[PDB]
């Protein structure tokens, strides 16, 4: 009721059973984006590029070294000066101009990817480029995490000049090819996640390249078991060199599945390229 | 807020309609407050 | 006046032609933002009693020659003038953002006030300075990047309407030079 | 999306191929039983406030443990969100009677349901059993036509099947 | 990817609206012309080689600019890319006229199409010329007013689909331009 | 498996590289705190029949709805299997105090736990909360040493974390 | 990738310096706080599945604009993809709190992280709110000022590590704003 | 870089995984033998001008052919660059006693050493044997502690091993 000039702020009272009154407070609720100033000649609004957008100069830089990464890795395939038989890009009949239109469709369909799969493939390829190189550098990933075509041409380029790809390691018995077939079914299930078939296993546009894509692989399926006896023997040791170390870490069951079945662990294709 | 509202005070330039009017009250109705807006 | 729809009429009237298939990607473009165009026009007229009070007080506390004795905001008549005299400019851009064009902003207020502020005394230093304090605060409300009050809206980009709106604000802001 | 349009115009693109008469045949089955499919849609549009309330405490009768603190139903603010949760399942099943397949279910309300609920300590066993209450909750010559319930009931036990 | 039976959801799902009979008469008129849609689109795939015949030929009928060597489209592999490109738009508009909705076009070919044509040196005025010949023969083929080719039909009104195909091809022509 | 042996002898093989002194350093931290790690193992080996029974009806106090027919605990035959189920979790956490990392947990008892339980209509919310009963159920200078509980308690809240 | 035993050398290689005992007392303080950093980071990953679930519930508690239909974050795949991105940043800051150095924070996510989000249409004001909750619960767990959860420790000052985690989420938060 | 931080925080990111107690264990071995590792660093910081000169003409005693024109040591300007070359090897080995592993060696001074030297007609056999002079040049209870030489000597024969 009546005030005094005394100082009792401190002090309490003790009669604080105080579970009888509960109190709170707030404050918050204020995001901020950095916006530009001065009307004469300017006003900028945020835009969706759905891409790398790390410079026009950086974008035209990015396809040049990954062309040089592929031409580095075309020069390990042709280390000795052979266009080696694991790379096949056709059929019996010529049709690599028809498989140009297969690959330029893949040059086009990967360009007309939507904004989820354009952006998901930027970040999964960055950690896969960490998986692609064995060593840990100050250099290699310091290209491969800013630039993504370089990361994409490394997970394609370095892995194709080993022999842990699809259709190149030959299974021994009926037992190996069947679980080789079954792990491909989940790679169908990855690229076909639901009732819609994806745009990216489309492998063709015209009637001529429809059945050309079927007879292209059947000549390349033969050229696995055709080419050698020691490079395909080196494939079954190479098939554990992609699966054990950067695909199934921690699972011993999935580790001895590679060392008991290398050709089944060779079309497991966990590089999610939507194929 | 200042009053109930904030409306245009009538001592501004272009405070009229000025559409199909006479000659003596066109240039009186256009150029309302040019008595000091140019003379200075 | 002309809105954002009446902009594409008169120059296509000037080409003696029809509203063809060329401007269909602009008269579908203003159809899409009209949820968030109408959401942005509400954001300035909500806070406008705090906005013009902040605009005069920030102008006065850094330029104390407006509280000079015998000055432009010295008396209570001349202080209550400028609380209205910079608020009508805030009111006129609130119609101009809703129309999607600043065609109303010239023929209603910008025809005259460059040679009218000096015609009764109001100088060129602080009236340009009174707009820019409203300008960096008008971009904060539409982007929800204020410091003290966070408006609960949906998720989306607002730089496209910020490079719009600034135009109206600043156009009147200059004008006075 | 997921319909017969997502089958045959996508497989002809996946073959790089014309819309041949395999693709033209598959949509004829839409036409003869869209009248079978689309008097079921206005039932749960007519009962969009009726059967959300009868499914919540039918679930909360057989799941009555939730009302303690520290669980998924500790206050009415959870239950105010809980009738939102069954209705958001109920919105999508109405839309799958329109698109034919389970189009709005899988890409919006099914995929990754098994990464959310018990991480938010929400019981998934109550989620299928609230739906399995409404699965048998039908009467085919009395509520709707006899040609309407077999699209409805096959989507509701699918919701238990898709959580499996 | 998307059809007219799922164009009508993503408005209602966005406002959380259960679809009832206020809008199901639009699909009742769309399941009305079910066989009528099939009777239209059987007549475009029947002579679908003949429409890619008449289009690029009528394109080189009007323009002898491309056939000059040193031009864009004079040679046969480049014309093979042309007669790839000419049927693929024809292959894709058949899907949209099947679906009753243009979204199956709108991601699979219109995504990034015109800037690849100026990355390759394709003149786009010849493209909107050639799709206009494709547009002009398709409306004769869904109807019964060709020169020689007359299929058996049940007669009646077919102009609602004729407005649909005429709103489909120019949307492709709005993409390449 | 999962240990520091699974890190450095596998990464040197993944680099195609010698066991250099980065790999020789990583196992030294085993040696100075295996004595910290391996008086915790004989506690739950000494209490391998003691704390299985005290965790089951501490879970079944806060999950007492199970005893109706048609659910996960409809008879004692379920409860005879249920003390097997917590002990089979409890076997592996004992082994992870020996191998260092969570070696026997992930490849045997963790991966694909979210494909099993509510498909068998077993509640996953009771599974983490039976474990979260035992997570805080410790007393670090009294039951074991103070250097022993921080390996134990970090594995038990991991079991709620690995089900997330 | 890089840590506090390597941040001390990388500037000295720009000047080709032999490292001496003039800077190792910073590292002698770092090797002093070996178990003290280790008694911090175990308490982060003890309960961080609760930390992800506390953050994006409380971010929805302040803003129901995401859960509204037509919003960015409202459906079930979308929340699972939200709970994906909600974990991955907590996974990364624990690496830098293990490192004593946020180089591993920068290159692995923050290169272009900010405007992939508006390449997806993800609201960046909601991102800084959710990680501010993850800022606030993280210091309560590397101290003993949680609500119920009191882990076993030995007593002493840990505010130097609490300032080190204070320099971490805002480096993300400035790299997403 | 190359340390135990480059093992376990990278492998948990390569697994997409938490810093579990496999990762928290691996750095404990730094702590108990950093005192073993970091009185070796100020030895070759204290002898950063002492043992560069004693290794050059110990190498140039057993490689004395270089002083003719047309070779790698044709003038003193080569030898003024040659004491720079052994010291630039000697800088990095000092830094690997600090980071634990061979961090500054491989990404800066080891990788692609076999693309440089005999292309610049520099003999690689003198490069390992100048280092192998300094490899056995130690005395473990007299120069440093007994816990300090086994990090030093294992890095110097590694320099012959990494050139192999
Ligand atoms: C919605 C209306 C709403 C919430 C949901 C809830 C979320 C929330 N929590 C905090 C602050 C903290 N949250 C913490 C998390 C936990 N505490 C625990 O003991 C368990 C292990 C865990 C929950 C799963 C912690 C430690 C804090 C710090 C303070 C405290 O001890 O409580 C906030 C505020 C964040 C901030 O401070 O900016 C929010 C929103 N609260 C709600 O209001
Ligand atoms: C794995 C081996 C390899 C190397 C090296 C390489 O550069 N490409 C592969 C296989 C390969 N393919 C060819 C030959 C041709 N390829 C084409 C189609 C090209 N046109 C295109 O539009 C594209 C997509 C970018 C391609 C590849 C054509 C027309 C030929 C001509 C050969 C012929 O039958 O006349 C070659 C051989 C030539 C070459 O150096 O590329 C190789 C090795
Ligand atoms: C990081 C510096 C590691 C390291 C890695 C190694 N990389 C090796 C070969 C190699 N490196 C690259 C990336 C780089 N080289 C290029 O030519 C280009 C771009 C044009 C880049 C970005 C590639 C592509 C290759 C393979 C082909 C090649 O040799 O150029 C390498 C040799 C063995 C191997 O191939 O793996 C190593 C050891 N080196 C280090 O020490 C740090 C730790
Ligand atoms: C081992 C217990 C791991 C682990 C395994 C999981 N893998 C999952 C899916 C998956 N795993 C692989 C690799 C492996 N599985 C195989 O069947 C074969 C070959 C015969 C191999 C090498 C693949 C290729 C796939 C995708 C489809 C498939 O199952 O085959 C999985 C399910 C969740 C997921 O999709 O990742 C688990 C749980 N996960 C672990 O936590 C431990 C370490
Ligand atoms: C305008 C575009 C056409 C035209 C269209 C009409 N079609 C009519 C009836 C009709 N068409 C079919 C065949 C259709 N059903 C199929 O299952 C398949 C392929 C597997 C196809 C091509 C049938 C079976 C019917 C009768 C069923 C019905 O629609 O009622 C029709 C008249 C409807 C009627 O007679 O009641 C029209 C106008 N007809 C034309 O003359 C132009 C060229
Ligand atoms: C996308 C990942 C695919 C799945 C799933 C699949 O099964 N095939 C991929 C694309 C695809 N292709 C068709 C139809 C054809 N595909 C052809 C190429 C394939 N044929 C082959 O012999 C081989 C190598 C083994 C391949 C890849 C051809 C030829 C056709 C048929 C053209 C024709 O004669 O009609 C389909 C649709 C399958 C169906 O019958 O519905 C899909 C999805
Ligand atoms: C009440 C009868 C239920 C129950 C409901 C709760 N759900 C909660 C959150 C939640 N629910 C879903 C699934 C549902 N919501 C959707 O928005 C959609 C799709 C459009 C679906 C299928 C999601 C995805 C979420 C998280 C985001 C959100 O809040 O919407 C919830 C709140 C949990 C909490 O905040 O702690 C409740 C109470 N819970 C039950 O146990 C009974 C069975
Ligand atoms: C010829 C009468 C046309 C014309 C055609 C051209 N298209 C050219 C390249 C091209 N176009 C596309 C888009 C379209 N074609 C497809 O194959 C697909 C699907 C994958 C689509 C959407 C692509 C993808 C490409 C590149 C691969 C290809 O050739 O198919 C092109 C350039 C060839 C040249 O170098 O001469 C031409 C001429 N352009 C015209 O002016 C008329 C209208
Ligand atoms: C009782 C306190 C629990 C409860 C337990 C049940 N678990 C049942 C089956 C089951 N449990 C597991 C996980 C566990 N068992 C193992 O063998 C291992 C690893 C070695 C672990 C982690 C599995 C894998 C299975 C299926 C195979 C099996 O039966 O062992 C179960 C029987 C269910 C039934 O038959 O219907 C019960 C009752 N259930 C509860 O709700 C409370 C929380
Ligand atoms: C501040 C962030 C914390 C806190 C830190 C302290 N920890 C102290 C002692 C300590 N902690 C551990 C265990 C640690 N080493 C490991 O190898 C592992 C797991 C693999 C862990 C968790 C040990 C062994 C010690 C004693 C050795 C030592 O650090 O001296 C401590 C006391 C320091 C001292 O007594 O000298 C502090 C302040 N403690 C807190 O209260 C907050 C929450
Ligand atoms: C003298 C005892 C040696 C010898 C030394 C020479 N090295 C020459 C060039 C050179 N050396 C290296 C390796 C070294 N230098 C570095 O900067 C670093 C890393 C920081 C290392 C490990 C490099 C990379 C180069 C080329 C670039 C450069 O000049 O630094 C050199 C000059 C050769 C010339 O210019 O013709 C000499 C004389 N040569 C010998 O044969 C004895 C054994
Ligand atoms: C068929 C189930 C049995 C018979 C009679 C019953 N009719 C009942 C009707 C009823 N159903 C509902 C919910 C209903 N509304 C919906 O929108 C949907 C799903 C899309 C459902 C299932 C309501 C609110 C009623 C009462 C009002 C009415 O009659 O419409 C019913 C359930 C119990 C009840 O509430 O009456 C039974 C039983 N007759 C038979 O021969 C069948 C055994
Ligand atoms: C520390 C928790 C508080 C204090 C005293 C208590 N001691 C208790 C002991 C107790 N604990 C168990 C289960 C125990 N055995 C195990 O193997 C494991 C896990 C590996 C655990 C937790 C049992 C059966 C007892 C009773 C017999 C005994 O004392 O050993 C306890 C729990 C309640 C009880 O049963 O006695 C408390 C409380 N003292 C303090 O200062 C701490 C607050
Ligand atoms: C151990 C090698 C034998 C014994 C005696 C010796 N002591 C010698 C000492 C010596 N060492 C150096 C170089 C030294 N300084 C460094 O920084 C490093 C490497 C990091 C080294 C090896 C120098 C300049 C001396 C002389 C001055 C001193 O004593 O410190 C040595 C080498 C010959 C010499 O110069 O004296 C021998 C031999 N005693 C034993 O029992 C061991 C057999």
């Amino acid at each position: 009721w009546d005030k005094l000039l005394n100082t009792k702020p401190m002090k309490r009272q003790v009669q604080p059973n105080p579970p009888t009154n509960e109190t709170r407070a707030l404050n918050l609720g204020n995001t901020f984006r950095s916006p530009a100033f001065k009307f004469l000649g300017t006003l900028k609004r945020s835009k969706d590029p759905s891409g790398l957008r790390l410079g026009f100069y950086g974008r035209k830089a990015d396809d040049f070294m990954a062309r040089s990464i592929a031409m580095q890795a075309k020069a390990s395939a042709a280390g000795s000066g052979v266009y080696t038989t694991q790379c096949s890009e056709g059929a019996s009949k010529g049709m690599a101009e028809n498989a140009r239109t297969a690959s330029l469709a893949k040059q086009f369909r990967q360009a007309q990817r939507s904004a989820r799969e354009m952006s998901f493939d930027y970040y999964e390829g960055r950690k896969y480029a960490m998986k692609a190189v064995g060593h840990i550098c100050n250099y290699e990933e310091k290209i491969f995490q800013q630039y993504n075509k370089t990361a994409a041409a490394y997970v394609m380029g370095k892995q194709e000049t080993l022999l842990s790809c699809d259709r190149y390691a030959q299974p021994a018995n009926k037992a190996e090819e069947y679980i080789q077939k079954s792990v491909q079914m989940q790679m169908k299930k990855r690229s076909i996640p639901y009732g819609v078939y994806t745009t990216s296993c489309a492998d063709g546009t015209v009637k001529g390249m429809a059945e050309n894509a079927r007879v292209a692989k059947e000549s390349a399926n033969f050229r696995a078991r055709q080419m050698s006896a020691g490079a395909k023997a080196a494939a079954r040791f190479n098939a554990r060199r992609v699966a054990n170390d950067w695909h199934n870490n921690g699972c011993n069951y999935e580790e001895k599945l590679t060392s008991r079945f290398p050709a089944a662990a060779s079309s497991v294709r966990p590089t999610t390229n939507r194929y | 807020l200042t009053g109930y509202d904030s409306k245009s005070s009538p001592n501004f330039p272009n405070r009229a309609a000025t559409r199909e009017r006479r000659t003596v009250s066109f240039n009186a109705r256009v150029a309302r407050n040019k008595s000091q807006a140019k003379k200075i | 006046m002309l809105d954002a729809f009446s902009r594409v009429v008169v120059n296509s009237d000037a080409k003696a032609a029809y509203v063809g298939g060329s401007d269909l990607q602009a008269l579908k473009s203003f159809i899409a933002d009209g949820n968030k165009r109408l959401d942005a026009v509400n954001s300035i007229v909500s806070n406008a009693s705090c906005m013009v009070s902040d605009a005069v007080s920030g102008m006065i506390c850094e330029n104390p020659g407006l509280i000079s004795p015998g000055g432009n905001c010295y008396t209570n008549r001349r202080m209550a003038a400028c609380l209205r005299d910079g608020e009508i400019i805030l009111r006129y851009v609130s119609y101009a953002l809703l129309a999607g064009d600043a065609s109303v902003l010239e023929d209603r207020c910008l025809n005259g006030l460059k040679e009218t502020y000096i015609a009764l005394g109001v100088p060129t230093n602080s009236s340009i300075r009174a707009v820019s304090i409203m300008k960096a605060q008008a971009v904060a409300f539409i982007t929800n990047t204020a410091t003290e009050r966070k408006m609960s809206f949906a998720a989306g980009d607002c730089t496209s309407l910020a490079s719009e709106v600034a135009s109206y604000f600043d156009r009147v802001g200059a004008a006075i030079s | 999306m997921k319909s017969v349009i997502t089958t045959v115009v996508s497989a002809a693109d996946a073959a790089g191929r014309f819309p041949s008469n395999s693709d033209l045949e598959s949509i004829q089955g839409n036409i003869q039983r869209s009248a079978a499919r689309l008097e079921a849609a206005e039932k749960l549009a007519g009962n969009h406030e009726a059967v959300v309330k009868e499914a919540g405490d039918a679930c909360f009768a057989k799941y009555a443990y939730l009302k303690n603190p520290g669980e998924a139903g500790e206050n009415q603010e959870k239950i105010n969100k809980c009738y939102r949760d069954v209705d958001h399942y109920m919105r999508l099943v109405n839309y799958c009677l329109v698109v034919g397949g389970t189009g709005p279910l899988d890409e919006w309300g099914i995929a990754g349901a098994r990464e959310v609920y018990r991480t938010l300590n929400l019981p998934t066993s109550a989620y299928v059993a609230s739906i399995a209450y409404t699965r048998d909750r039908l009467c085919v010559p009395r509520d709707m036509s006899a040609q309407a319930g077999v699209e409805f009931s096959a989507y509701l036990d699918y919701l238990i099947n898709a959580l499996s």
Side-chain angles (χ1 to χ4, degrees), chain A residues 1-37 39-275, chain B, chain C residues 1-149 151-177, chain D:
Chain A
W1 205 138
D2 201 325
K3 240 16 283 246
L4 85 195
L5 324 98
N6 124 112
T7 101
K8 74 251 248 171
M10 353 327 228
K11 272 194 326 87
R12 9 192 101 323
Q13 237 318 323
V14 265
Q15 292 36 115
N17 45 194
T20 140
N21 109 121
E22 128 295 313
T23 61
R24 282 98 224 300
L26 251 334
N27 53 93
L28 68 151
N30 50 12
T31 352
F32 175 89
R33 126 61 162 87
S34 39
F37 280 99
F39 136 55
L40 272 30
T42 252
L43 63 157
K44 287 300 140 200
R45 129 263 296 287
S46 215
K47 136 192 181 6
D48 209 317
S50 162
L52 58 90
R53 74 267 163 204
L54 286 196
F56 150 76
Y57 281 83
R59 205 182 283 105
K60 67 104 190 170
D62 170 59
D63 53 344
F64 168 67
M65 297 97 108
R67 174 196 297 119
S68 305
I69 283 167
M71 205 47 71
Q72 268 166 334
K74 280 316 177 41
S76 64
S80 71
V82 192
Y83 279 61
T84 85
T85 59
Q86 52 99 14
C87 80
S88 291
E89 64 65 56
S92 171
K93 175 56 205 53
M95 283 174 172
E97 303 95 309
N98 304 52
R100 184 156 154 125
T101 65
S103 45
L104 296 185
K106 296 296 122 171
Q107 294 177 335
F108 170 66
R109 195 68 75 151
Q110 292 280 138
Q112 56 159 17
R113 282 175 291 167
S114 64
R116 189 66 149 116
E117 64 202 62
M118 259 291 315
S119 45
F120 168 66
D121 287 347
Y122 170 46
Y123 290 166
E124 54 88 27
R126 276 168 65 180
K127 71 191 207 61
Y128 280 178
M130 297 283 206
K131 295 182 192 300
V133 65
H135 297 94
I136 295 153
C137 321
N138 288 337
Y139 187 51
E140 204 82 20
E141 84 287 339
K142 291 212 169 18
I143 290 104
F144 285 154
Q145 269 184 329
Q146 301 80 347
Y147 305 101
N148 49 348
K149 221 193 116 204
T150 69
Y154 201 52
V155 54
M156 225 59 70
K158 184 191 192 287
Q159 190 264 338
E160 272 278 347
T161 62
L162 295 174
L163 295 174
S164 312
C165 324
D166 207 312
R167 82 194 166 264
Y168 300 162
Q170 273 310 113
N173 51 0
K174 188 169 44 60
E176 188 157 13
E177 55 96 16
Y178 177 58
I179 44 175
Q180 183 176 30
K181 274 200 307 298
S182 73
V183 297
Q184 284 169 350
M185 303 296 139
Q186 291 98 50
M187 301 324 125
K188 319 309 170 228
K189 187 159 56 55
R190 173 197 298 176
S191 64
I192 315 298
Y194 272 125
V196 58
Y197 282 124
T198 188
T199 50
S200 184
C201 76
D203 54 43
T205 53
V206 175
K207 308 293 281 280
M209 65 194 313
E211 281 90 2
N212 181 35
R214 193 185 47 81
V215 294
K217 191 164 64 110
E218 294 147 0
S219 74
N221 281 8
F222 165 71
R223 285 174 297 225
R225 69 182 74 88
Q226 190 263 306
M227 53 173 187
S228 73
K232 57 174 67 154
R236 320 186 53 84
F237 275 79
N238 226 327
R240 299 162 249 157
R241 303 308 196 204
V242 308
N244 283 338
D245 44 352
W246 73 77
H247 292 141
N248 59 21
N249 45 350
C251 206
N252 276 150
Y253 164 73
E254 294 214 27
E255 275 156 5
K256 35 192 242 229
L257 273 178
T258 74
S259 65
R260 290 176 60 194
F261 299 94
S266 199
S267 64
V268 286
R269 319 184 299 113
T271 81
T272 71
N273 299 310
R274 311 163 317 137
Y275 296 144
Chain B
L1 264 296
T2 306
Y4 293 133
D5 66 281
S6 65
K7 81 190 309 305
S8 195
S9 41
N11 284 110
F12 211 54
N14 296 126
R15 279 299 108 198
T18 72
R19 184 44 65 88
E20 287 102 16
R21 305 294 215 158
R22 303 211 292 142
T23 52
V24 284
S25 178
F26 191 52
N27 299 321
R29 274 264 173 97
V30 186
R32 289 294 277 256
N33 307 318
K34 298 286 106 180
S35 300
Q36 288 98 5
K38 58 100 182 176
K39 159 77 187 83
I40 304 298
Chain C
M1 51 175 289
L2 311 161
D3 72 321
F5 288 85
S6 298
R7 168 71 40 195
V8 307
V9 186
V10 192
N11 46 9
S12 62
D13 165 69
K15 295 184 186 320
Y18 286 77
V19 190
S22 70
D23 66 277
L24 290 177
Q25 303 321 292
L27 296 194
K28 195 254 296 176
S29 180
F30 212 72
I31 305 298
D33 66 340
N35 295 345
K36 67 187 291 292
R37 170 58 49 117
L38 268 293
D39 267 310
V41 172
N42 186 35
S43 58
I44 288 96
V45 300
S46 46
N47 302 330
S49 67
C50 186
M51 287 166 89
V52 70
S53 69
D54 193 85
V56 183
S57 74
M59 184 186 54
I60 274 174
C61 75
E62 77 191 51
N63 186 279
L66 312 177
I67 316 299
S68 87
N72 242 195
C73 293
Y74 168 66
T75 76
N76 261 352
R77 177 190 50 84
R78 289 204 220 98
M79 189 36 188
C82 184
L83 281 162
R84 213 188 52 163
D85 214 351
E87 199 189 57
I88 295 165
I89 287 93
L90 161 69
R91 190 176 64 87
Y92 280 161
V93 70
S94 297
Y95 316 112
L97 176 58
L98 186 56
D101 193 19
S103 296
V104 66
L105 199 57
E106 296 99 11
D107 50 0
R108 295 301 165 97
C109 60
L110 258 66
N111 279 119
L113 84 165
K114 178 191 88 58
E115 60 264 17
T116 310
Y117 282 165
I118 52 181
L120 78 163
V122 188
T124 65
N125 47 16
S126 66
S127 85
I128 291 294
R129 196 41 205 91
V131 170
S132 54
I133 168 169
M134 266 195 290
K135 197 210 83 165
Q137 151 153 324
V139 69
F141 287 146
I142 62 170
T143 49
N144 206 358
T145 326
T147 45
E148 69 274 8
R149 168 154 178 257
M151 273 190 176
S152 315
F153 274 69
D157 189 273
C158 286
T159 78
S160 37
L161 268 75
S163 60
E164 191 83 27
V165 41
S167 96
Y168 313 79
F169 221 32
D170 233 61
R171 275 237 263 87
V172 132
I176 321 174
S177 298
Chain D
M1 258 316 268
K2 178 159 158 316
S3 94
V4 175
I5 321 288
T6 64
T7 62
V8 294
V9 175
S10 71
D13 208 7
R17 190 175 166 85
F18 272 76
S20 88
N21 210 358
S22 196
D23 311 318
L24 313 169
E25 269 190 348
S26 88
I27 56 157
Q28 175 61 258
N30 282 339
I31 314 180
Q32 313 304 304
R33 275 180 49 90
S34 64
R37 216 167 54 243
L38 286 133
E39 74 265 304
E42 46 268 64
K43 201 50 192 209
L44 84 154
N47 303 340
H48 67 288
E49 77 295 318
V51 309
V52 280
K53 53 88 163 187
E54 85 179 4
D57 322 303
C59 185
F60 284 154
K62 50 181 169 65
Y63 298 87
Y65 64 98
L66 272 83
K67 266 57 167 190
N68 60 333
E71 272 197 2
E74 90 270 2
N75 42 42
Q76 182 52 45
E77 203 264 352
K78 291 303 174 63
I79 318 180
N80 291 352
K81 293 181 280 200
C82 145
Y83 289 108
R84 189 249 302 152
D85 286 0
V86 175
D87 186 84
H88 278 199
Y89 276 119
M90 208 213 152
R91 281 190 295 117
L92 302 161
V93 153
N94 179 39
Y95 309 147
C96 298
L97 300 167
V98 189
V99 175
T102 59
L105 270 171
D106 51 348
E107 69 203 344
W108 283 337
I110 287 288
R114 316 157 301 118
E115 283 122 63
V116 172
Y117 295 143
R118 76 264 176 204
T119 84
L120 295 174
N121 59 300
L122 303 177
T124 62
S125 196
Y127 277 150
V128 289
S130 86
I131 294 169
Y133 165 68
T134 77
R135 199 255 310 147
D136 71 285
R137 194 50 147 81
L138 295 174
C139 202
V140 175
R142 186 203 56 132
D143 280 354
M144 332 201 281
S145 64
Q147 289 303 344
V150 175
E151 302 93 319
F152 211 118
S153 71
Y155 288 162
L156 301 183
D157 45 35
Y158 162 68
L159 281 205
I160 313 145
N161 272 32
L163 295 174
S164 304

